Design an enzyme around this catalytic site. Sequence first.
Site, short mmCIF file in Angstrom:
data_model
loop_
_atom_site.label_atom_id
_atom_site.label_comp_id
_atom_site.label_asym_id
_atom_site.label_seq_id
_atom_site.Cartn_x
_atom_site.Cartn_y
_atom_site.Cartn_z
N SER A 79 7.44 10.45 -26.04
CA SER A 79 7.07 9.25 -27.17
C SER A 79 7.46 7.79 -26.90
CB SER A 79 7.68 9.75 -28.56
OG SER A 79 7.20 11.07 -28.82
N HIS B 245 3.51 14.84 -23.47
CA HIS B 245 4.93 15.57 -22.80
C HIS B 245 5.32 14.68 -21.61
CE1 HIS B 245 5.46 18.85 -25.66
NE2 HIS B 245 5.23 17.68 -26.59
N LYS C 221 13.79 16.37 -39.34
CA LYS C 221 13.25 15.28 -40.05
C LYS C 221 11.53 15.86 -40.30
CE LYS C 221 13.55 10.60 -39.07
NZ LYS C 221 13.04 9.46 -38.05
N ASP C 222 11.15 16.58 -39.46
CA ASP C 222 9.81 17.18 -39.47
C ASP C 222 9.61 18.23 -40.60
OD1 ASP C 222 8.79 15.65 -37.51
OD2 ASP C 222 8.54 17.40 -35.90
N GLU D 216 -17.40 10.34 -49.46
CA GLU D 216 -16.00 10.96 -49.34
C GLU D 216 -15.13 9.38 -49.35
OE1 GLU D 216 -18.78 12.00 -48.34
OE2 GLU D 216 -17.98 13.87 -46.63
C1 HEM Z 1 -5.96 16.54 -35.02
C2 HEM Z 1 -5.48 15.18 -34.96
C3 HEM Z 1 -4.36 15.15 -34.23
C4 HEM Z 1 -3.25 15.80 -33.94
C5 HEM Z 1 -2.71 16.95 -34.60
C6 HEM Z 1 -2.29 14.74 -33.42
C7 HEM Z 1 -1.06 15.19 -33.05
C8 HEM Z 1 -0.11 14.42 -32.75
C9 HEM Z 1 1.28 14.87 -32.47
C10 HEM Z 1 1.90 16.07 -32.82
C11 HEM Z 1 2.03 13.66 -31.74
C12 HEM Z 1 3.64 13.61 -31.42
C13 HEM Z 1 4.00 13.15 -32.96
C14 HEM Z 1 3.60 11.80 -33.10
O1 HEM Z 1 4.18 10.80 -32.23
O2 HEM Z 1 3.25 11.56 -34.35
C15 HEM Z 1 1.07 12.87 -31.45
C16 HEM Z 1 1.05 11.61 -30.83
C17 HEM Z 1 0.11 10.66 -30.47
N1 HEM Z 1 -0.98 10.77 -31.05
FE1 HEM Z 1 -1.91 12.08 -32.18
N2 HEM Z 1 -2.80 13.58 -33.18
C18 HEM Z 1 -4.24 13.67 -33.53
C19 HEM Z 1 -4.99 12.68 -33.69
C20 HEM Z 1 -4.69 11.28 -32.80
C21 HEM Z 1 -5.66 10.40 -33.05
C22 HEM Z 1 -6.87 10.33 -33.84
C23 HEM Z 1 -5.08 9.35 -32.32
C24 HEM Z 1 -5.34 7.88 -32.04
C25 HEM Z 1 -7.10 7.67 -32.16
C26 HEM Z 1 -3.88 9.74 -31.87
C27 HEM Z 1 -2.88 9.15 -30.98
C28 HEM Z 1 -1.63 9.53 -30.52
C29 HEM Z 1 -0.74 8.74 -29.69
C30 HEM Z 1 -1.13 7.41 -28.99
C31 HEM Z 1 0.29 9.51 -29.87
C32 HEM Z 1 1.83 9.11 -29.18
C33 HEM Z 1 2.45 7.82 -30.23
C34 HEM Z 1 3.54 7.54 -29.84
O3 HEM Z 1 4.53 8.16 -28.95
O4 HEM Z 1 4.11 6.37 -30.53
N3 HEM Z 1 -3.61 11.00 -32.09
N4 HEM Z 1 -0.25 13.34 -32.31
C1 LIG Z 2 -24.42 18.89 -36.61
C2 LIG Z 2 -23.48 17.80 -36.87
C3 LIG Z 2 -23.39 16.56 -37.07
C4 LIG Z 2 -24.82 16.00 -37.00
C5 LIG Z 2 -22.48 15.68 -37.46
C6 LIG Z 2 -22.18 14.43 -37.25
C7 LIG Z 2 -21.43 13.59 -37.77
C8 LIG Z 2 -21.22 12.11 -37.49
C9 LIG Z 2 -19.87 11.20 -37.87
O1 LIG Z 2 -18.68 11.92 -37.54
C10 LIG Z 2 -18.40 11.77 -36.08
C11 LIG Z 2 -19.85 10.77 -39.36
C12 LIG Z 2 -19.35 12.12 -40.08
C13 LIG Z 2 -18.87 9.69 -39.34
O2 LIG Z 2 -19.73 8.51 -38.77
C14 LIG Z 2 -18.67 7.87 -37.90
C15 LIG Z 2 -18.92 9.43 -40.94
C16 LIG Z 2 -17.80 8.18 -41.12
C17 LIG Z 2 -20.22 8.80 -41.60
C18 LIG Z 2 -19.95 8.39 -42.92
C19 LIG Z 2 -21.21 8.19 -43.93
O3 LIG Z 2 -21.07 9.21 -45.02
C20 LIG Z 2 -21.73 9.40 -45.94
C21 LIG Z 2 -21.71 10.44 -46.78
O4 LIG Z 2 -20.64 11.45 -46.38
C22 LIG Z 2 -22.53 10.75 -47.98
O5 LIG Z 2 -22.27 11.83 -48.57
C23 LIG Z 2 -22.79 11.67 -49.91
C24 LIG Z 2 -23.57 9.61 -48.12
C25 LIG Z 2 -23.80 8.56 -47.09
O6 LIG Z 2 -24.93 7.58 -47.54
C26 LIG Z 2 -25.54 7.77 -48.47
C27 LIG Z 2 -22.88 8.28 -46.14
C28 LIG Z 2 -23.00 7.21 -45.08
O7 LIG Z 2 -24.02 6.27 -45.21
C29 LIG Z 2 -22.11 7.35 -44.07
C30 LIG Z 2 -22.05 6.16 -43.00
#
Ligand code: HEM
Ligand SMILES: C/C=C(C)/C=C/C=C/[C@H](OC)[C@@H](C)[C@@H](OC)[C@@H](C)CCc1oc2c(O)c(OC)cc(OC)c2c(=O)c1C
Lengths: 181, 365, 97, 73, 29, 66, 241, 49, 99
Positions: free
Chosen positions: B191, B187, B213-214, B257
């Site tokens: 955007s 904000h 739209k939402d 997954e």
């Molecule tokens: C629990 C997950 C998330 C929630 C609820 C969330 C929610 C939102 C909302 C409501 C907005 C404004 C509406 C929109 O532009 O879509 C927004 C914008 C944005 N979000 Fe997220 N977000 C999440 C995860 C992420 C992730 C993982 C990234 C990138 C790694 C990210 C990057 C951004 C950026 C850069 C904007 C502005 C985009 C633009 O203005 O073009 N968000 N997000």
């Molecule tokens: C106490 C909490 C703890 C320790 C949480 C830690 C979480 C770590 C990471 O999240 C940040 C992690 C989920 C994320 O890594 C970036 C995923 C993309 C990893 C994906 C992932 O999944 C597997 C999976 O689901 C399986 O299921 C049957 C079996 C698997 O191989 C046999 C895998 C596997 O080989 C990998 C790389």
Amino acid sequence: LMKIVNNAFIDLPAPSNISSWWNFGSLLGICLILQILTGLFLAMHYTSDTTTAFSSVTHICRDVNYGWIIRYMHANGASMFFICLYMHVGRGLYYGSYTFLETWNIGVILLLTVMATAFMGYVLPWGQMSFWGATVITNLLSAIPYIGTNLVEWIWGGFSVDKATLTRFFAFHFILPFIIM
Amino acid sequence: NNAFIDLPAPSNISSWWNFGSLLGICLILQILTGLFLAMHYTSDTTTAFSSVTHICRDVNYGWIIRYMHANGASMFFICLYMHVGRGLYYGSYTFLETWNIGVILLLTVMATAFMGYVLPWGQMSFWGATVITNLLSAIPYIGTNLVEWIWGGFSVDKATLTRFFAFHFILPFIIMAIAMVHLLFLHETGSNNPTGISSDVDKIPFHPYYTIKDILGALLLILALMLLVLFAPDLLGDPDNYTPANPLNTPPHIKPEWYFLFAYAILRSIPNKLGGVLALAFSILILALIPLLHTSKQRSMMFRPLSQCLFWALVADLLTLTWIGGQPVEHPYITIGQLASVLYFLLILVLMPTAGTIENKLLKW
Amino acid sequence: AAKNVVSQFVSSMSASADVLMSKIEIKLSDIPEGKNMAFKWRGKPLFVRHRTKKEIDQEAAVEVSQLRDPQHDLERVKKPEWVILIGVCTHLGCVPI
Amino acid sequence: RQFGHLTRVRHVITYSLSPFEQRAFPHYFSKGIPNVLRRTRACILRVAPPFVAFYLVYTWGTQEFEKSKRKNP
Amino acid sequence: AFDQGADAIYEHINEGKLWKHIKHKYENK
Amino acid sequence: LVDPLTTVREQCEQLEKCVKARERLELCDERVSSRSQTEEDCTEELLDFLHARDHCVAHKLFNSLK
Amino acid sequence: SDLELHPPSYPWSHRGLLSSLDHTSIRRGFQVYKQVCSSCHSMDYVAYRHLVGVCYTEDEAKALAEEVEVQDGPNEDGEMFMRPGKLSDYFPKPYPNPEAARAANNGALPPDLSYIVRARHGGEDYVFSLLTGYCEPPTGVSLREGLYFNPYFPGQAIGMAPPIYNEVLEFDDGTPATMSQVAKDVCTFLRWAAEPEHDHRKRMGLKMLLMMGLLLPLVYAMKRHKWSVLKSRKLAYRPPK
Amino acid sequence: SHTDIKVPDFSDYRRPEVLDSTKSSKESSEARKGFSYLVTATTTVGVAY
Amino acid sequence: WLEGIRKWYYNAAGFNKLGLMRDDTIHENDDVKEAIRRLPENLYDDRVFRIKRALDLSMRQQILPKEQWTKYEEDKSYLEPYLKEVIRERKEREEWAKK
Ligand code: HEM
Ligand SMILES: C/C=C(C)/C=C/C=C/[C@H](OC)[C@@H](C)[C@@H](OC)[C@@H](C)CCc1oc2c(O)c(OC)cc(OC)c2c(=O)c1C
Ligand SMILES: CCCCCCCC/C=C/CCCCCCCC(=O)OC[C@H](COP(=O)(O)OCCN)OC(=O)CCCCCCC/C=C/CCCCCCCC
Ligand code: HEC
Ligand code: HEM
Ligand code: HEM
Ligand SMILES: C/C=C(C)/C=C/C=C/[C@H](OC)[C@@H](C)[C@@H](OC)[C@@H](C)CCc1oc2c(O)c(OC)cc(OC)c2c(=O)c1C
Ligand SMILES: CCCCCCO[C@@H]1O[C@H](CO)[C@@H](O)[C@H](O)[C@H]1O
Ligand SMILES: CCCCCCO[C@@H]1O[C@H](CO)[C@@H](O)[C@H](O)[C@H]1O
Ligand SMILES: CCCCCCO[C@@H]1O[C@H](CO)[C@@H](O)[C@H](O)[C@H]1O
Ligand code: FES
């Protein structure tokens, strides 16, 4: 990260003469954080099945490292919470703080929510007081004309306090403190 | 008002900007269904799987709540990847704080979904818990200690399941708070929009334009979700998790997954333990480096054809990785996976920045 | 004070008293040649496998210097027809088939 | 960021009609389809090639995997 | 009306397959 | 009592795809059985045959079942 | 072997988007489970009450439960005792534990079938093909004692001898009990056992589609209505020359 | 002069009932609004259901 | 002919189809925001209108009639002299900061 962290705390203007009775607000905050932290660590070992609930609590106290201290801190923390709550409310009544209407009414809701939270937490160990406390308190709703009984059974998830009740009380006890925060 | 209703919004944001509100809706739907599930779930390894079947068989409408929670997690990820993709293509990552909080949101949702998946205590739950927590063992000197500490023992067991239920329960709420900060930061700038050009000269109120739209977007999300829940509830799941956990046997075709397959393909591509864990971590954390690798004088890819081609190569490459992750570690999949994994980092670290510079020269700046 | 409290909480997540190593006795006669038998031991698969002469010979022929974790088969067994192993993949913990 | 403090704009005139005075789907198909076709053509050379490549690697790879499992590939 | 109409469509599409359709064969109270 | 599965399988085995698969299978049988030492077996040929046949059976069988 | 044979797709009457399970078929399938499968396979998550209103009346299901004896107690002396089963009882387990099950099946473990259909790729197509797919081992294949060749089972060597065949049981409705008929009904029953919400979810699916069929065009019309103000706006730039 | 400013033709966007500039549009305003109001009421009932 | 490919790229980039000039598309960092502030009124008001027109077209997912597309040969940098100076001034300040 400046403001609201800032003009919101550090440079917050405070009366120069607030006494010790004004400490209870921060103490309630601390009680809340203590309850949440100890509670979370307990949740890491507690199981809500009526066949294992009491046993999981004894396991925390007997075999979990420092489980006994975390468990008794949570239990006595609840008591400290209430001592602070009552002092806090008492301060408000004596000093006319309740004239801050919104703050005071939200305060009343906090009091009711903490009471409900402590009540439910007390049911979790599933000892005798837990069970009868759950029976009596939920039954307060049965005083509601015509539907009270329906409400109670709905809350219980059955015709009596049983498995369904304990499991949902663990989930409610878990989330309410965060709502309170 | 001036927080919602009168919030100035670019007049030209497209459907790709609907995913932020859809993620918010996904989060709320997960929290609500999750809470209702938590009301009947027990985390003791002797009753976890049974309590889930009880929800599905005897709790009134338990099956619908359970499958909404499961497919909701899939919808959540589809929206997450679209959301991130939009941000990469349009240069939204230049809103540094919002983007970095976004990266943290991504990792937190991944951790959350992982833990939730362990709760039913099926075969995938058990082995997923084993493998993922073991990623920490790649840490020199303390890795193994960290794993056993997380597990609460020398192996995934009772202590693990109970604490994963508590973590799964609280993380979504932490995610919600972090998402609120994600919004607060957004904000401050407002955007970005498809052209990547400031839209201060053409803003329109959030309400009624985007509120409507939402709602439309939300309806389509509910449609996608309910089509899965009511007509194909298991389509996106794994039959193996309908089998209770067996610590003495890892299913032979075990796979992650679907939303984790690409990262899994990447880790699996490297015949070195530390190497694979580092590449898995980097496949996600590279997101935090994107802002630093931006070489283009223009913000959005809308006006950058070369960048667009590479962007789509990257999407097709993630699709390739997703497909490979679903296949056995046998020829020719092993090589396709290694090439796709190399291409992934190549596109992001070299090709895209290079394309950025080449486009600048073609435009004489 | 902070150091003690924090470590007590961190300590609560480590293995509790009930989780901490009984030996296990296994009857070799019940395991036919060529069979890999798995048992749960100290919370993990314990493999007791009865090897064939061909398996023993193949393992003997391995060019040890080329292994990433170089060990001769005879450094890993007491009686060649019996290989006993912790059935946990050293990569990320799955159970090898 | 609020209206009144966004930015400086001078000499621009905007004309608009109430929604109740106009059709919501003006030339939906007559002009809509053509525009969708223009937009599709405008991007296909950028979007399609990578997915056709994926499609090629996929069919080649799958088939290569199947052939490798039988007696006479 | 929506619920009744929808159920009718469903029951018609599944004529003779539902319990309500074969129930008479086993009851007789 | 005749299981329609038997009938349907016979009719399905008449299709060219199945006759061809059956022929590669009979060839394999001959080849394999004629040896004393071989690691070969005819699983592949059998599966190819069953795949062609059962695809056909699946299209018809339920028309004979209650 | 490592080769795989995937089951073909059968035209189950519950295969379509709005297609419910055939309840007479579920009824027969239960009879198959009761007379055949239950001697080796448990069905831990299904109870007699679950059959009521699905394929048996309450009285019929009560009579079925009563056909068996289940342990109950302790009684006043602290003793366990046997009693006739009732609606609340779950289907009796053929074995006290999986070890006994393996010991009674040459080392193989008959899995619980409550979810078999959902726990296997292929679902009922797989179970049906497996059940009607036993055949003699192909030339060159020799299975250890206790194993049977079934081309649909992974590895093709299964520890379950063909459990069904012509007349393996008599159906309560006179239906010719050929092997394939028996397989088809037990598969239908297994689908229901793994997904009792099957019919209900499709009926809700119908209502959901109908509602979305209404609400989507309506909300879209509202979107177009509001946006029309921006869609037709015209701009003019008039700088002082 | 500002008097050179003329609203552009919108005939291409106008509902047919307001195309005649020599006729009052009030004669159709009730119908035009009723339609839109029918859509809203129905959306609301559908959502409440 | 690098220029052959340049005109091809200019049209492929396509901001000219929205009637934009190359400088209208520059990512606005602090140097750029200062350069824009320094623009003479007419150039500033022109930039504002071309962007407003482009955002409006984008919103409708439309483009201008081909006769109105910015032409490669006519697109000149109106921002360069202002931006170059803003960048030279900042570089100067940084040198003094380093001392
Ligand atoms: C629990 C997950 C998330 C929630 C609820 C969330 C929610 C939102 C909302 C409501 C907005 C404004 C509406 C929109 O532009 O879509 C927004 C914008 C944005 N979000 Fe997220 N977000 C999440 C995860 C992420 C992730 C993982 C990234 C990138 C790694 C990210 C990057 C951004 C950026 C850069 C904007 C502005 C985009 C633009 O203005 O073009 N968000 N997000
Ligand atoms: C106490 C909490 C703890 C320790 C949480 C830690 C979480 C770590 C990471 O999240 C940040 C992690 C989920 C994320 O890594 C970036 C995923 C993309 C990893 C994906 C992932 O999944 C597997 C999976 O689901 C399986 O299921 C049957 C079996 C698997 O191989 C046999 C895998 C596997 O080989 C990998 C790389
Ligand atoms: C949210 C912040 C989380 C960070 C951690 C909070 C810690 C708060 C700091 C404590 C200040 C209060 C002083 C308490 C003195 C206790 C004396 C003590 O530590 O004795 C040690 C003893 C162990 O001794 P042994 O097992 O025999 O052997 C030790 C050798 N291995 O441990 C204890 O007695 C435990 C003490 C429990 C403290 C209560 C927890 C308080 C936490 C509050 C969190 C919130 C913030 C409040 C603000 C702090 C204001 C001071
Ligand atoms: C004991 C004599 C059995 C009877 C009667 C039935 N089954 Fe069975 N079944 C049995 C064993 C020992 C096994 C294990 C096989 C192995 O080698 O692992 C099985 C297995 C199955 C399976 C699962 C196959 C898989 O993919 O893992 C199914 C679906 C199955 N059995 C079905 C089934 C049904 C429906 C039966 C009655 C018609 C039936 N079985 C009877 C042993 C025995
Ligand atoms: C306002 C906050 C809270 C209050 C007042 C509170 C109060 C209580 C009470 C009175 C008990 C009974 C203790 C006993 O006698 O054994 C209890 C138990 C419990 N609480 Fe809380 N609690 C709070 C927060 C939490 C939170 C945040 C969690 C979980 C995230 C939690 C988890 C538990 C658990 C698992 C138990 C059972 C173990 C035990 O009995 O000690 N509590 N709580
Ligand atoms: C970001 C939000 C969330 C995500 C992505 C998520 C995702 C998941 C996933 C993938 C599963 C496994 C489902 C399955 O296949 O059976 C699961 C299970 C579960 N979740 Fe969540 N969850 C979220 C929020 C919550 C919340 C807030 C709660 C509880 C307060 C919760 C409670 C449960 C419970 C009890 C289970 C076990 C039952 C089941 O498997 O369905 N989840 N979750
Ligand atoms: C799902 C959640 C539900 C239904 C929560 C509802 C909570 C209601 C109230 O909180 C707002 C309630 C806790 C609060 O009433 C204002 C308390 C002061 C009630 C005090 C209370 O306690 C008892 C108790 O603890 C017992 O234990 C052994 C036994 C009891 O008699 C035998 C009582 C009792 O006779 C009363 C009045
Ligand atoms: C919406 C596109 C869905 C693609 C259909 C296949 O979907 C796949 O089915 C497999 C088993 O059949 C699952 O194990 C896998 O997780 C799932 O993604
Ligand atoms: C992605 C492929 C880039 C190839 C460089 C484009 O090159 C351009 O192609 C136009 C149409 O073919 C020609 O009219 C133009 O003269 C030529 O320079
Ligand atoms: C958002 C960043 C604002 C930058 C404002 C720069 O401002 C410029 O700084 C120069 C110093 O070298 C001065 O000589 C010049 O007069 C001044 O306009
Ligand atoms: S190969 Fe990764 S856990 Fe074994």
